[PDB]
Amino acid sequence: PDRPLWFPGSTPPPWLDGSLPGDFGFDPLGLGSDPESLRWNVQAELVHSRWAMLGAAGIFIPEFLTKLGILNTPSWYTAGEQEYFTDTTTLFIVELVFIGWAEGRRWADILNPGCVNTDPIFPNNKLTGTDVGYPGGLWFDPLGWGSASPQKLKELRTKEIKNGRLAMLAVMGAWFQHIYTGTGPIDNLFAHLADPGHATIFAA
Amino acid sequence: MRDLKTYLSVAPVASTLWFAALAGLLIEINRFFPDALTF
Amino acid sequence: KGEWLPGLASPGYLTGSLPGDNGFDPLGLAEDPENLKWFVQAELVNGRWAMLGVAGMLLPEVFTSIGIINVPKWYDAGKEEYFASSSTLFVIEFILFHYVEIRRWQDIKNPGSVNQDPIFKQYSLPAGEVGYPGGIFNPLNFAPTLEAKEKEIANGRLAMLAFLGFIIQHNVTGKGPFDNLLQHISDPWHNTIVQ
Amino acid sequence: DIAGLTPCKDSKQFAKREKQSIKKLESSLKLYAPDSAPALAINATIEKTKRRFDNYGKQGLLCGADGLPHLIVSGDQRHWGEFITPGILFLYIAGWIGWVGRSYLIAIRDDKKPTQKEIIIDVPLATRLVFRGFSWPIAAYRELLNGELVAK
Ligand code: CLA
Numbered sequence: 001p002d003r004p005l006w007f008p009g010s011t012p013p014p015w016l017d018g019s020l021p022g023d024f025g026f027d028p029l030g031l032g033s034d035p036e037s038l039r040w041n042v043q044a045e046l047v048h049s050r051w052a053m054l055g056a057a058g059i060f061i062p063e064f065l066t067k068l069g070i071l072n073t074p075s076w077y078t079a080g081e082q083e084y085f086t087d088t089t090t091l092f093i094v095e096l097v098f099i100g101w102a103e104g105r106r107w108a109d110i111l112n113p114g115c116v117n118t119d120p121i122f123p124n125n126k127l128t129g130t131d132v133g134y135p136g137g138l139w140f141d142p143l144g145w146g147s148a149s150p151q152k153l154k155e156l157r158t159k160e161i162k163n164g165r166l167a168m169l170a171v172m173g174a175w176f177q178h179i180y181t182g183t184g185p186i187d188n189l190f191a192h193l194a195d196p197g198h199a200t201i202f203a204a
Numbered sequence: 205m206r207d208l209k210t211y212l213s214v215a216p217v218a219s220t221l222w223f224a225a226l227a228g229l230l231i232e233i234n235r236f237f238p239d240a241l242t243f
Numbered sequence: 244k245g246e247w248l249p250g251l252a253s254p255g256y257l258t259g260s261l262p263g264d265n266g267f268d269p270l271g272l273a274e275d276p277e278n279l280k281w282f283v284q285a286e287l288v289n290g291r292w293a294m295l296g297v298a299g300m301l302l303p304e305v306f307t308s309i310g311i312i313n314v315p316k317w318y319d320a321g322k323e324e325y326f327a328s329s330s331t332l333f334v335i336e337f338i339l340f341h342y343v344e345i346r347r348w349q350d351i352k353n354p355g356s357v358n359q360d361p362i363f364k365q366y367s368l369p370a371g372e373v374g375y376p377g378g379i380f381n382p383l384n385f386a387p388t389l390e391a392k393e394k395e396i397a398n399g400r401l402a403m404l405a406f407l408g409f410i411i412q413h414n415v416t417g418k419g420p421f422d423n424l425l426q427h428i429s430d431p432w433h434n435t436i437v438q
Numbered sequence: 439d440i441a442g443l444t445p446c447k448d449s450k451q452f453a454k455r456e457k458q459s460i461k462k463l464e465s466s467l468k469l470y471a472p473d474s475a476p477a478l479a480i481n482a483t484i485e486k487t488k489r490r491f492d493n494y495g496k497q498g499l500l501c502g503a504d505g506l507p508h509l510i511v512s513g514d515q516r517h518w519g520e521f522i523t524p525g526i527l528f529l530y531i532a533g534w535i536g537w538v539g540r541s542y543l544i545a546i547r548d549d550k551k552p553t554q555k556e557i558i559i560d561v562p563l564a565t566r567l568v569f570r571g572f573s574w575p576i577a578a579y580r581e582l583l584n585g586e587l588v589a590k
């Protein structure tokens with residue numbers, strides 16, 4: 001409510017208090033001005049953050065070890081085009097039925113916040129989350145680190161969304177660098193570390 | 205934003221978006237299954 | 244009663260009264276109560292024929308594969324020669340169904356109006372629900388309970404799906420349903436919609 | 439065959455037409471280097487021409503003396519793909535559009551200023567009616583049977 005803003009001296013939009021984690025008053029196009037949309041965009045930002053972080057660590061760490069020798073994992077940009085134990089199109093069907101189910105229940109939870117906290121096969125199992133986007137329970141917060149004081153939950157979720165935002169620019173950078181340069185990300189960083197003033201986005 | 209969403213719903217705007225989507229659909233059906241005279 | 248989609252608002256005309264109510268009418272086919280009444284009977288009769296047919300399609304193929312009988316595949320049995328011409332069979336099938344189905348029809352239009360024998364006018368079905376004639380159609384006197392009706396409808400919905408599978412699977416693999424299953428068990432990760 | 443025609447798969451003028459057509463494109467093809475973008479493109483047209491002619495032959499289309507397919511719409515069961523079948527599909531879609539269209543005018547007809555939802559689409563309402571079209575034969579038949587479809 002008196003927090004640092006993405007634009008010091010500017011005035012934050014009325015729909016952004018500071019009660020949301022990662023609230024820095026940035027929405028110059030009013031994409032979240034309607035409260036119904038702002039709640040949907042929070043959930044969309046949360047899942048974009050969590051997929052980007054898994055994706056970032058899934059392309060930066062494995063490529064970081066193959067550039068050496070600890071791993072031999074192929075280029076992240078081409079790992080999809082190679083063949084596996086079954087064909088790629090069977091893996092995609094198994095992915096949809098498995099991810100669609102998990103996505104379906106998350107969807108139901110967004111539109112009806114308490115309806116899917118109970119295990120449909122063994123109704124003894126239950127999730128523990130109170131807020132949409134933080135399902136809790138044993139399967140997603142087995143340590144109990146998700147249930148804390150609202151002061152710590154504000155920071156912990158701000159750490160969550162900040163790491164997810166950075167990961168989003170990073171993953172999108174890894175996709176763009178691989179097309180403008182011609183190698184992997186670990187190569188780009190060393191090249192820029194070999195000569196910082198010249199080995200950049202300029203080649204001409 | 206709600207004013208903008210109202211404008212985006214006005215007859216001409218909703219028509220181009222509807223017919224654009226329609227044209228794309230019919231074009232791609234014709235790229236995938238061209239020269240269909242029967243059925 | 245049940246939810247086909249946990250957390251989704253059931254249509255308001257699906258009130259938990261019909262066996263098999265799981266709130267599933269997303270396209271609103273049954274909002275008009277008279278559609279609902281007719282579709283209940285239509286689901287019962289399609290599900291009952293699917294159960295007879297799917298059993299008649301799958302189970303004989305299973306018992307040939309075992310070797311206790313040897314009968315044609317279901318999509319070949321029409322070719323076989325029978326004591327009567329197939330056009331003769333069809334005419335008697337038409338005449339017998341025409342009588343029996345108009346009678347089922349009258350009871351939908353006018354419940355109870357056709358429960359008595361028209362020839363031996365001393366015999367009669369007892370009063371009951373449409374689509375559940377009972378009496379001589381229930382000679383073992385099973386209680387037509389809610390649970391029984393719900394199992395009837397679940398089995399009918401599954402057989403209807405299975406019949407859909409037999410049809411599409413045959414026009415894609417040329418073989419028969421128990422064949423598709425045995426072939427799939429062989430090495431499943433390679434024969435699964437690769438055709 | 440029907441109407442003195444012959445199957446396009448047996449028709450000499452049909453085959454001549456494919457041949458004259460490919461020869462036309464090959465006269466243009468020979469202008470360009472074989473790797474070039476125009477060569478690939480003209481070749482793409484050529485293969486599509488070949489796919490088309492074999493496809494019409496395999497679908498059972500009858501041809502006239504002109505070497506062109508002629509459609510049989512009379513009802514004959516060997517030619518339902520030429521009218522009955524795409525026609526059922528047209529009526530199904532056309533009725534869907536009209537039934538949805540009527541659903542929207544009825545939904546807004548008792549509103550305060552009804553012409554306001556006619557020049558500014560209530561898109562939320564429309565997304566809720568758009569799938570009423572899937573069952574228009576049953577819904578329209580039902581409104582008929584109980585006096586709801588036509589006014590007196
Ligand atoms: C809800 C839409 C709708 C419906 C159900 C009908 C239905 C009918 N019209 Mg009508 N009509 C419409 C819109 C509609 N019309 C519009 C917009 C115009 C202006 C161009 C006309 C002009 C028109 C003429 C000039 C004639 C008819 C006639 C007829 C009758 C015979 C069928 C016919 O000729 O179609 C003809 C259809 C058209 C000429 C054009 C309409 C097609 C548009 C694209 C459909 C409406 C789209 C609408 C925007 C949907 C928005 C819904 C969304 C918000 C959810 C039938 C009662 C004829 C008749 O009276 O016969 C008895 C006749 O002579 N109509």
Ligand SMILES: CC(/C=C/C=C(C)/C=C/[C@@]12O[C@]1(C)C[C@@H](O)CC2(C)C)=C\C=C\C=C(C)\C=C\C=C(C)\C=C\[C@@]12O[C@]1(C)C[C@@H](O)CC2(C)C
Nearest residue numbers: 027028029030048051052054055058059076077079168169
């Ligand atoms: C960054 C992007 C979002 C950027 C959007 C921001 C800027 C929008 C900013 C604004 O809207 C605001 C806020 C307010 C408005 O007023 C103004 C604007 C300016 C409009 C999301 C990317 C989201 C990117 C995420 C979702 C991608 C996850 C990808 C994972 C799954 C990848 C997995 C794999 O990479 C591995 C791990 C290994 C490989 O070998 C194989 C594969 C499969 C490739």
Ligand SMILES: CC(/C=C/C=C(C)/C=C/[C@@]12O[C@]1(C)C[C@@H](O)CC2(C)C)=C\C=C\C=C(C)\C=C\C=C(C)\C=C\[C@@]12O[C@]1(C)C[C@@H](O)CC2(C)C
Nearest residue numbers: 268269270271289292293296299300317320403404406407
């Ligand atoms: C009749 C039944 C099949 C009976 C077949 C039997 C007699 C076969 C007999 C024979 O085999 C023998 C024994 C011997 C063989 O030699 C020959 C034949 C002659 C072949 C199939 C019905 C099959 C019935 C089908 C599968 C019905 C599926 C419809 C479902 C999916 C509708 C879903 C939804 O409609 C809801 C409910 C509401 C909406 O809101 C949403 C949507 C999605 C629209």
Ligand SMILES: CC1=C[C@H](O)CC(C)(C)[C@H]1/C=C/C(C)=C/C=C/C(C)=C/C=C/C=C(C)/C=C/C=C(C)/C=C/C1=C(C)C[C@H](O)CC1(C)C
Nearest residue numbers: 294295298380381382383384398401402405408420423424
């Ligand atoms: C009323 C009466 C009265 C008296 O009193 C008494 C009594 C006698 C008791 C009664 C009678 C009754 C009876 C008749 C019953 C019958 C039933 C059956 C038929 C069922 C089926 C039932 C049916 C069923 C469900 C069906 C199911 C099916 C399945 C899923 C299938 C699967 C399949 C698939 C697809 C394909 C592959 O490849 C193969 C398989 C895997 C194999």
Ligand SMILES: CC1=C(/C=C/C(C)=C/C=C/C(C)=C\C=C\C=C(C)\C=C\C=C(C)\C=C\C2=C(C)CCCC2(C)C)C(C)(C)CCC1
Nearest residue numbers: 511512513521522532533534535536537540574575578579
């Ligand atoms: C078969 C055939 C044929 C013929 C045909 C005929 C001859 C027909 C006729 C027809 C007729 C003679 C008709 C009539 C009709 C009438 C009327 C009376 C109608 C009306 C309608 C309505 C009323 C509608 C409504 C609606 C709907 C339903 C939906 C949409 C919307 C609307 C509203 C429009 C031919 C040879 C071609 C071909 C082959 C096949």
